[PDB]
Every structure is written in C-alpha cells, then in structure tokens.
C-alpha cells in the first residue's frame, strides 16, 4: 500500500517539524518583555466620521499619501474619501454590489474591488476624460474574492474562496502564478514591506507564507482552532499577527517559525474581523463582532485600550502609512478616524 | 470660512456626490431583494425561466414592484463566510424537488440544507417561499415507488394529495421559529403561470408585516 506508507511519512515529517520547533522554543516572548514598561492606557478620540454609505461597509484601504481612503460597501459603491476635509473625492458605481475587498494602488492611480462575482476589477482613477473607468476585469477564480493587494501598477495578488491565491499581470489580465496548498477558503492576505513575500490565512486554521516570484509555499503556521479572518505583517516583515473566529489573535515569527504570542481575554467571546499594527509595531489593533476594537500591547499581550463608537460589527481596520490615524469601518455604514 | 476657491469647489463636488448617493439609496430602497436557494438539479432554473462565474442576478418587474433575485448557485465555498451578506434580503426562495425522494437520500439532503438555512442566525426574521417542483413527475413515480423508502414512519396511501401534504408538513416542521418567520409553500410544475403571482403575494405579506412593525402596530 503506497498510500498508507505515504501517509506515515507525512506523519513522521510532521513530528520532525514539531520537534525542531520545540527545540527552538528555549524561552517565550512573555519572559523577555517582562522588564518592558507597559504602554499605559491609550485613549483615542474620533476625529472624523465618514457618512454616505447606505449599507454595510466591508473593506477599506488607506492610500500611501495618508489622506485618501477607498471604502467599499454592499450598496454597490466605492467611495474615495479625503480624510482631512471629509469631502468625497470619487464615487464609483460597481457592476456587482457583493463586494468583500478593496485595494488602493501604492501609486494612487488605481483601485481594486472584488467579491461574490469571482472577479477582481481594476478601476483607473486618473483619466483624460475626468471620470473613473474600469481598466480591467480579472477572471479566473472559481470562488469569491476575499482580499486583493497591489504590488505595483501592473501586478496584483488576490485570494479566493476556491482555496487558492493568484498573482496577476494587469496588462494581459492573466495569472502569472497560482499558490495552492490551503485546504479551506483563504480569507485575507498581507504583503511584506518589501513585497518579496506574503502570508495568507485560511479557514483551515492555517497561515501560509509564500514567495511571490518562485510561487511556492515556504512555511505553514498552525495553532488557531477556527477560521482565520485577518492577517498582517509586523512593520519589519519578520513576524505577522493573525486573528480568528475563536476570539484570539496570535503573533507568529517567521524566522523562529513558531507561535510567539497570544492575545485573548475571557470577556471576549466573539470573532475577530480585522487586525492592524502601529508604525512602531508596539500596538496591535483588532476589530471584533462585539462592535468595537481592542488595542493590545503586542509585546506584553495586555489590553491597552478600546475604540468603542460603532453600532455594529467592526468589519475593517486600517492604520495609515505615516502612523497618525486609525480608520474603522463597520456594518453600521460609517467610517471613523481616530487619534 | 477659511477655505480656498478650490476647496469650495471641492466641497461643492462632494455635495453633488451626496445628492446622487442619496438618489441611488432611495431607488435601492424601493427594491425587493430575493435570495434564490436550493439543492442542485432541482427546479431552480425552471423558476428562473418562468420569472423572466459567481452570483447570478435576475431583475424583473411585476405590478409596479421591481424584483432582484440572487442565485448563489455555482458558489462552491463555505456558506458561513458569505451568507451574512444576504442579511436583510426580503425573502428566501427555496426550491425542493418532489421527485427527489427516491434518488444519502437526496430529499434528506434538501431537508438538511433547508434546516441549516431556516434556523440560521442571519435569517431569524426572514420569510421563506418554498417551491416544491416537478409535481408531475412525482405524480408518476408515487405509483411505482412508495414514500416509505424515503420516510420510514409514513402510513399513508400512494396518492398525490396525502403524500404531498406529508412532504410539506415535514418541511414546515423544520421551522424552529414559527412565531417570527412565515413559510409560504407552493406546489408548482414545469408548466405554470402563477408562480410569479404567488411570490408577489408572499412579498406583499412580508412588506405589510414590515410596515406593521414600522407603524407601531407590532
């Protein structure tokens, strides 16, 4: 029986990986940050409130200039917002209203949008006609689009509920590499600061680290008991935090290859919808279905603060590239900016 | 006001965007949204053809009411991750084939799907329009194959009315929230004209109940 032998070899290989990881875990992060002063209490106030979406907000993404936002709602519209003045720069009618993700290109020229139509639409912001046009539709996924991130004006990574990720060349509209290996629906992506690597968490309770050019998985990270809904690299790109439906955040280190910290509380029993870091990486921000956001001390695992102020599930978060403000979106139809 | 001329034109463009987003939302608010659902190889396509790759949307108009139907078939992914997108649908049309009892048992799969949908936390107060399709083929088969093979405890004769009523009751007993949501059951065939009218009546009842909740009688 080749299959039985093959299953065995998988088992001893998994045991070897577990042993090599236990060998690496000489000390915990909680034992080294025990001499580090706590951040104290962090109070943040709403500074702006963004009104105009007439349905649940599913995704938002800051621009790299730290003023403009793209926000996606089930009302079938993207809104590009000026965060300083609250003015709406653009309103983009979507061909399909069942959007789940939105991306803003780092150059600022394009926005990506996708969802239950299994398509990633690229909208050109800067046209001679003075309107926003659909520049391309990327088809080829057989499950819904759950996340998308630009690497450049011509390359985008998407993740799908068909268990796979894809890297697309935008000019030709073709997949240049497909990333397979998750056995459940892939929920979220995060790109490394240098965009050579990216992590994806899926509904198999697993996060995989992928090399973009080679197109193959480098590492697999386990430990969550339920679906992973959110994932995010640490600022330097040597760690990432994941958030799941089991009411837990977990910080993983790429070079150590283990789980490094757990962020949970007995008073929290709801799923985690979104996670984000601060510029220094000292704060981990998470949005919950309890209708608020928690600010964790990412090195001491303490709860440092709370962002309350939403009437529904905090569906999405975003920390701005220059670090001044936090944005929260929600199923209550409103975006809020916090300082 | 300490705004530039260009700032004031930017604010004026933002307010125009406000107006149109309000017009779009008002137009959306007059719309009846239907979640079309059911097992594969059922009369779902028959229903769609009588009314008129991810989500498929169908739009039709009947008696000054505009209807949007969302076929979420061809989405082979975990339902729990996108079903909450349809929280706020006015009604769920659910297609079950009556001819599927003698084909695990396929009708039992339809019951499992119905049970998972009706008692979902996102559809607590969402009504269900249940279509039992292919009653003509069910008429033919009920002679050769009894309903006992599908239902061990059935104690009735091989007649359309009694077996059909048994199936309907079997489906309506899966409702664990009978005091919050109605189940409208219709017995339709391949060649019918009254399906749209039945959906219209059920949606009118749902609208009337929502208006009762708004006006304060409920």
């Amino acid at each position: 029986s080749e299959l039985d032998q093959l299953r065995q070899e998988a088992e001893q290989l998994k045991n070897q990986i577990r042993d090599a990881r236990k060998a690496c875990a000489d000390a915990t992060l909680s034992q080294i940050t025990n001499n580090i002063d706590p951040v104290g209490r962090i109070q943040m106030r709403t500074r702006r409130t963004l009104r105009g979406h007439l349905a649940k907000i599913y995704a938002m993404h800051w621009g790299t200039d730290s003023r403009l936002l793209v926000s996606a709602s089930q009302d079938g519209k993207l809104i590009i917002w000026d965060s300083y003045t609250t003015n709406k720069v653009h309103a983009i009618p979507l061909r399909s209203s069942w959007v789940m993700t939105c991306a803003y290109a780092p150059s600022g020229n394009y926005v990506a949008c996708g969802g239950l139509d299994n398509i990633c639409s690229i909208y050109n912001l800067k046209t001679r006609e003075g309107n926003v046009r659909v520049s391309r539709e990327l088809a080829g996924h057989t499950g819904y689009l759950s996340c998308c991130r630009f690497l450049d004006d011509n390359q985008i990574v998407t993740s799908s509920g068909d268990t796979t990720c894809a890297l697309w060349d935008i000019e030709t509209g073709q997949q240049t590499t497909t990333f397979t290996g998750h056995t459940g629906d892939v929920m979220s992506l995060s790109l490394a600061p240098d965009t050579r690597l990216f992590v994806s968490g899926a509904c198999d309770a697993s996060a995989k680290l992928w090399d973009v050019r080679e197109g193959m998985c480098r590492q697999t990270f386990t430990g969550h008991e339920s679906d992973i809904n959110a994932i995010c690299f640490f600022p330097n790109g040597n760690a990432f935090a994941t958030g799941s439906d089991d009411a837990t955040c977990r910080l993983f280190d790429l070079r150590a290859d283990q789980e490094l910290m757990t962020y949970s509380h007995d008073n929290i029993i709801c799923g985690i919808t979104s996670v984000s870091f601060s510029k220094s990486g000292r704060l981990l921000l998470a949005g919950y279905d309890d209708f608020n956001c928690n600010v964790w001390d990412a090195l001491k695992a303490d709860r440092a603060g709370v962002l309350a102020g939403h009437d529904n599930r905090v569906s999405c978060l975003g920390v701005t590239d220059d670090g001044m403000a936090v944005a929260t979106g929600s199923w209550d139809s409103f975006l809020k900016i916090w300082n | 006001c300490t705004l530039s001329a260009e700032d004031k034109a930017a604010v004026e463009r933002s307010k125009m965007i406000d107006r149109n987003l309000r017009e779009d939302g008002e137009k959306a608010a007059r719309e009846v949204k239907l979640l079309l659902l059911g097992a594969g190889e059922s009369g779902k396509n028959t229903i769609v053809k009588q009314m008129k790759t991810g989500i498929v949307e169908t739009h039709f108009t009947f008696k000054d009411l505009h209807f949007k139907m969302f076929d979420v078939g061809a989405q082979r992914s975990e339902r729990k991750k996108w079903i909450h997108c349809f929280e706020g649908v006015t009604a769920i049309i659910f297609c079950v084939a009556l001819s599927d009892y003698d084909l695990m048992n396929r009708m039992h799969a339809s019951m499992k799907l119905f049970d998972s949908i009706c008692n979902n936390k996102w559809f607590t107060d969402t009504s269900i329009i249940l279509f039992l399709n292919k009653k003509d083929l069910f008429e033919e088969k009920i002679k050769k194959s009894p309903l006992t093979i599908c239902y061990p405890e059935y104690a009735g004769s091989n007649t359309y009315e009694e077996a059909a009523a048994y199936i309907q009751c079997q489906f309506e007993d899966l409702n664990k929230r009978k005091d919050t949501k109605e189940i409208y059951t219709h017995f339709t065939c391949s060649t019918d004209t009254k399906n749209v009218q039945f959906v219209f009546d059920a949606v009118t009842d749902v609208i009337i109940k929502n208006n009762l909740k708004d006006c304060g009688l409920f």
Partner: single-chain antibody, 232 residues
Framework: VQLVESGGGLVQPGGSRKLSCSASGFAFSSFGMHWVRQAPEKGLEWVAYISSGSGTIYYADTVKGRFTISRDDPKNTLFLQMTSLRSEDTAMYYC??????????????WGQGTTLTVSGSDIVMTQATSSVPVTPGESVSISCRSSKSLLHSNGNTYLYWFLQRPGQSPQLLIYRMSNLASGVPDRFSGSGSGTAFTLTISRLEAEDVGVYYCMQHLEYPLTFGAGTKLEL
C-alpha cells in the same frame, strides 16, 4: 478631448452676440467651465466661470451685468450671452475646462477660441519682463510676483503656469506650484516662496518658445500675469 468654440465675427457696438462651446470626448457634466479672453495684442484675462452643476457662477467686474454664462449639459454645450458690446470686448475667446477635488489639475484643457471684433482688491501679478532672448540647450528662469502671498493655510500655493505657442491656445505647465502637468516634459520646473515665483526650463528646445503666463487661483477674479515672451 475637444472644446470647439463657435460664434464670433464682426458685431456693432451696443449689440449682442452668443458664443457656443461644444465639448466632446470627456465627462462634461463633471467639469467646471471658464471663459477667458485675449485682446488682439494683450495678455489673457479671465472673463466668467460656471461650476459643475451650475451651482456657482462668477464674472469679472468688467463684464458683470452685460455678460451671461450658461451650460446645457445634455447637449454638451456652454453658452455666453453678450449684450451692450464695447470696443474693449474685441478679443479671442477661449473656453477652458476645470475640475476641482483633492489632487486634481485645473485649467488643463483650452479650446481653440473664436475671434469677436467690435466696430481694487484684485490680486495683481506682475511679470517684470516682456522678452527673454534665448538659445537652445540653455537654462531659463522666468519670474512672477504677487501683491499678496498665494500660500494658504492648506499648504497650497495657488500659482498656475501657462505656455502659449505662436498661433495656438495656452497649455498648462505647472498647476499647483511645483506640480508638473500631464504630458509636459520634465524640463519644466516650478518653485517659489509666498509672493516670488520662478519657472525653470532646462535643456531648452525650439518648441519651448512662446509666451509664459503666471495665474493665481486663491479667489475670484482670477488674474493672469502680463506674460514673458521667449525669442529665437
């Protein structure tokens, strides 16, 4: 993108004439539209402005009460009604598109214009030079000055630079001071401090010869500079 002006010709003093501007190739409803005149030998002068959606309308003090601006958005045309025409109204009229939002570039497309022949608190901007003899390949520095600082609490300095080539309509070069316009070579650059403004041209070409105009967009009326002409 095309803006084609129509009307014009010879008109008697005290009469009336209607100028039309047919827009094609862009989202006309989304754009504010200006009318700017150029006298037969003088520089540019802003005449009228109608915003997107007709919400706001501005006129110059020298035409208020005699001139009217309207837009028929469905038929894609802008109209100017002129009454009590004077001798000072003899000019070539340019229809200019403008769009306003964070990061946009106003005054970016100019029409071809039509010729009409008739038988105190304003910000004044001076280009203290009228001609600059130059040769290809060298650097050039043109200057403008403002009566009041064009810098705003926004951090925006509202200084536009325009180039008019011989027998042509003006072209936007630098829109908000130091921002290069679309399709403009990098040879051009802009700098300034509040009231003193410089346009720098590197590796000069034969195409770059023309008249350069500084404009302000702090408040209305919009004021153009006198213009500096480049020779050879």
């Amino acid at each position: 993108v095309q803006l084609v002006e129509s009307g014009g010709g010879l008109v008697q003093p005290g009469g009336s004439r209607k100028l039309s501007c047919s827009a094609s190739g862009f989202a006309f409803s989304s754009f504010g539209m200006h009318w700017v005149r150029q006298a037969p030998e003088k520089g540019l002068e802003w005449v009228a402005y109608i915003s997107s959606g007709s919400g706001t309308i501005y006129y110059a003090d020298t035409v208020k009460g005699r001139f009217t601006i309207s837009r028929d958005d469905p038929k894609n045309t802008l109209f100017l009604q002129m009454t009590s025409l004077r001798s000072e109204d003899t000019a070539m009229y340019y229809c200019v598109r403008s769009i306003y939002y964070y990061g946009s570039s106003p005054f970016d497309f100019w029409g071809q214009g039509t010729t009409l022949t008739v038988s105190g608190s304003d910000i004044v901007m001076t280009q203290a030079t009228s001609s600059v003899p130059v040769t290809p390949g060298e650097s050039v520095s043109i200057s403008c000055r403002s009566s009041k600082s064009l810098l705003h609490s926004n951090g925006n300095t509202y200084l536009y630079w325009f180039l008019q080539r011989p027998g042509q309509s003006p072209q936007l070069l630098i829109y908000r001071m130091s921002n290069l316009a679309s399709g403009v070579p990098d040879r051009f650059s802009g700098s300034g401090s509040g009231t003193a403004f410089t346009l720098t041209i590197s590796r000069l070409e034969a195409e770059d010869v023309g008249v350069y105009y500084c404009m302000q967009h702090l408040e209305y009326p919009l004021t153009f500079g006198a213009g500096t002409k480049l020779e050879l």
